[PDB]
Design an enzyme around this catalytic site. Structure first.
Site, PDB file in Angstrom:
ATOM      1  CG  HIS A  38     -37.881  11.154  58.221  1.00 27.70           C
ATOM      2  ND1 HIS A  38     -38.797  10.137  58.504  1.00 27.70           N
ATOM      3  CD2 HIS A  38     -36.626  10.644  58.317  1.00 27.70           C
ATOM      4  CE1 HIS A  38     -38.074   9.048  58.729  1.00 27.70           C
ATOM      5  NE2 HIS A  38     -36.765   9.300  58.637  1.00 27.70           N
ATOM      6  CD  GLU A  87     -32.616   9.677  59.721  1.00 21.94           C
ATOM      7  OE1 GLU A  87     -31.810   8.756  59.457  1.00 21.94           O
ATOM      8  OE2 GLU A  87     -33.771   9.737  59.243  1.00 21.94           O
ATOM      9  CG  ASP A 102     -31.601   3.390  59.358  1.00 19.52           C
ATOM     10  OD1 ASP A 102     -32.662   3.040  59.888  1.00 19.52           O
ATOM     11  OD2 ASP A 102     -31.436   4.503  58.885  1.00 19.52           O
ATOM     12  CG  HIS A 107     -38.703  10.139  54.186  1.00 17.03           C
ATOM     13  ND1 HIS A 107     -37.668  10.687  53.447  1.00 17.03           N
ATOM     14  CD2 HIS A 107     -38.177   9.383  55.178  1.00 17.03           C
ATOM     15  CE1 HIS A 107     -36.558  10.235  53.999  1.00 17.03           C
ATOM     16  NE2 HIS A 107     -36.814   9.457  55.048  1.00 17.03           N
ATOM     17  CG  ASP A 147     -36.348   5.389  60.405  1.00 16.79           C
ATOM     18  OD1 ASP A 147     -35.267   4.676  60.402  1.00 16.79           O
ATOM     19  OD2 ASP A 147     -36.500   6.436  59.702  1.00 16.79           O
ATOM     20  CD  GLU A 179     -33.640   7.010  61.863  1.00 12.51           C
ATOM     21  OE1 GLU A 179     -32.975   6.057  61.402  1.00 12.51           O
ATOM     22  OE2 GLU A 179     -34.469   7.653  61.190  1.00 12.51           O
TER      23      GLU A 179
HETATM   24  O1  LIG Z   1     -34.146   4.408  57.517  1.00 11.10           O
HETATM   25  C1  LIG Z   1     -33.896   5.268  56.689  1.00 11.10           C
HETATM   26  N1  LIG Z   1     -34.211   5.124  55.407  1.00 11.10           N
HETATM   27  C2  LIG Z   1     -35.021   4.013  54.937  1.00 11.10           C
HETATM   28  C3  LIG Z   1     -35.707   4.352  53.642  1.00 11.10           C
HETATM   29  C4  LIG Z   1     -35.690   3.462  52.578  1.00 11.10           C
HETATM   30  C5  LIG Z   1     -36.243   3.854  51.390  1.00 11.10           C
HETATM   31  F1  LIG Z   1     -36.179   2.998  50.347  1.00 11.10           F
HETATM   32  C6  LIG Z   1     -36.830   5.074  51.190  1.00 11.10           C
HETATM   33  C7  LIG Z   1     -36.844   5.938  52.261  1.00 11.10           C
HETATM   34 CL1  LIG Z   1     -37.548   7.517  52.066  1.00 11.10          CL
HETATM   35  C8  LIG Z   1     -36.300   5.596  53.479  1.00 11.10           C
HETATM   36  C9  LIG Z   1     -33.206   6.575  57.089  1.00 11.10           C
HETATM   37  O2  LIG Z   1     -33.415   6.922  58.449  1.00 11.10           O
HETATM   38  C10 LIG Z   1     -31.721   6.580  56.672  1.00 11.10           C
HETATM   39  C11 LIG Z   1     -31.592   7.669  55.616  1.00 11.10           C
HETATM   40  N2  LIG Z   1     -32.883   8.369  55.591  1.00 11.10           N
HETATM   41  C12 LIG Z   1     -33.028   9.588  54.873  1.00 11.10           C
HETATM   42  C13 LIG Z   1     -32.635   9.673  53.547  1.00 11.10           C
HETATM   43  C14 LIG Z   1     -32.748  10.876  52.874  1.00 11.10           C
HETATM   44  C15 LIG Z   1     -33.250  11.985  53.511  1.00 11.10           C
HETATM   45  C16 LIG Z   1     -33.644  11.903  54.825  1.00 11.10           C
HETATM   46  C17 LIG Z   1     -33.537  10.709  55.514  1.00 11.10           C
HETATM   47  C18 LIG Z   1     -33.837   7.781  56.368  1.00 11.10           C
HETATM   48  O3  LIG Z   1     -34.987   8.149  56.477  1.00 11.10           O
HETATM   49 MN   LIG Z   2     -35.137   7.925  59.136  1.00  8.69          MN
HETATM   50 MN   LIG Z   3     -33.484   5.009  59.631  1.00 13.64          MN
END
Ligand SMILES: O=C(NCc1cc(F)cc(Cl)c1)[C@@]1(O)CCN(c2ccccc2)C1=O
Ligand SMILES: [Mn+2]
Ligand SMILES: [Mn+2]
Length: 365
Positions: free
Chosen positions: A221, A254, A141, A229, A152, A349
């Site tokens: 998200h 995703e 990812d 996010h 993403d 995703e």
């Molecule tokens: O690319 C990704 N993450 C990178 C990311 C690195 C970082 F340090 C901080 C953030 Cl917020 C995001 C993902 O697609 C994989 C998991 N995930 C997610 C986690 C919890 C709730 C919902 C989704 C994502 O968004």
């Molecule tokens: Mn994501």
């Molecule tokens: Mn991701």
């Protein structure tokens, strides 16, 4: 033309500066059955679409870099490689194709290469000797961005055919989420549709059978400029919020499937960190803490970063300065998210643009 291995920035492959569109889709019809075809030829909608053309073009440039990086990764990712080797080889290609230039263009967040029960947020820190195994299930990812317009996009890597149905379940669930997404669609309906698809799959791994469970505390998200996010969540199980998707929003669609509990918890050493977008200016006198916050502000801003990236910038003995930033609430830690020991998790995703005229799956070629 692109070299093999890829080294030419996407910008140099499209001399006129017009980057390729992703897959364009008509929005889903309403329950009553009214189609959304009227958007494609609407005068008001084309005008609102054209107004944001520079934004869509930036997402398309970042998406093209992402596609060429992931086709390269699929060509060489093999068991026996350390996770550090995999991340550094992927990131070296991504830096080149995106033509990394401070906060104007670069890597949007660290390369996640979460394995097995760990579903997300795992990237090796310095000294991590973890090697990719033949029987592992690895979620690649990674993110690219131009002017903070983030792509993403993630996929699962396996070598053992025994996980093929688990991967198909999650891929089908993600494609369902992408199909269901649209302006005015209730986010809870997307989750219910995803779960219904994912749970229709049963898998047999080493003589044990499982129904594929979506990871209920993981979700899709909304995406904002330099904000992975942005505030809206796309559930992957039923029971979510009836809050609706809106015109001009960008989402990461995703899904995660699991043979475990279908719930993740923080586990292992933390590698991911990101500044809290809602925290304004904080004067810091503590010298190592001040220095690290300046390094973060210059190199990442509100984009996520990892410890390996701090090492690459030449920083050292920064762990206490980093914990100080976390304790002050300026930075937030994002530790690996794991289901139960012995469980397998998979993820797919894509990034979608909810354009006034159509739904563009910008990360899909
Ligand atoms: O690319 C990704 N993450 C990178 C990311 C690195 C970082 F340090 C901080 C953030 Cl917020 C995001 C993902 O697609 C994989 C998991 N995930 C997610 C986690 C919890 C709730 C919902 C989704 C994502 O968004
Ligand atoms: Mn994501
Ligand atoms: Mn991701």
């Amino acid at each position: 033309v692109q070299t093999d291995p890829p080294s030419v920035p996407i910008c140099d492959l499209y001399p006129n500066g017009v980057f390729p569109k992703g897959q364009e889709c008509e929005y889903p019809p309403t329950q009553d059955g009214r189609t959304a075809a009227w958007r494609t030829t609407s005068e008001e909608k084309k005008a609102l679409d054209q107004a944001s053309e520079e934004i869509w073009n930036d997402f398309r440039e970042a998406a093209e870099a992402h596609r060429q990086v992931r086709k390269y990764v699929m060509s060489w990712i093999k068991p026996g490689m350390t996770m550090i080797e995999i991340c550094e080889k992927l990131e070296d290609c991504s830096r080149k194709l995106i033509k990394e230039n401070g906060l104007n263009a670069g890597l949007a967040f660290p390369t996640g290469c979460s394995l097995n029960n760990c579903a997300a947020h795992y990237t090796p820190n310095a000294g991590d000797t973890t090697v990719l195994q033949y029987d592992d299930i690895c979620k690649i990812d990674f993110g690219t961005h131009i002017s903070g317009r983030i792509i993403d996009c993630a996929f699962t890597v396996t070598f053992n055919p025994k996980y093929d149905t688990l991967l198909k379940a999650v891929k089908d669930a993600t494609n369902t989420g992408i199909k269901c997404a649209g302006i005015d669609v209730r986010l809870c309906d997307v989750g219910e549709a995803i779960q219904e698809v994912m749970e229709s799959y049963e898998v047999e791994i080493d003589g044990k059978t499982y129904q594929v469970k979506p990871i209920r505390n993981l979700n899709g998200h909304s995406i904002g400029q330099y904000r992975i996010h942005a505030g809206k969540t796309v559930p992957i199980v039923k029971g979510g919020e009836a809050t609706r998707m809106e015109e001009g929003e960008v989402y990461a669609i995703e899904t995660f499937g699991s043979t475990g509990k279908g719930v993740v918890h923080d586990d292992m050493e933390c590698s991911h960190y990101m500044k809290n977008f809602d925290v304004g200016h904080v004067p810091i006198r503590l010298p190592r803490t001040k220095h690290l916050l300046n390094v973060i502000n210059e190199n990442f801003g509100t984009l996520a970063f990892c410890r390996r990236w701090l090492d690459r910038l030449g920083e050292s003995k920064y762990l206490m300065a980093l914990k100080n930033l976390c304790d002050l609430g300026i930075v937030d830690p994002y530790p690996p998210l794991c289901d139960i020991k012995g469980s397998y998790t998979a993820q797919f995703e894509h990034t979608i643009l909810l354009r006034p005229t159509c739904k563009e799956v910008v990360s899909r070629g």
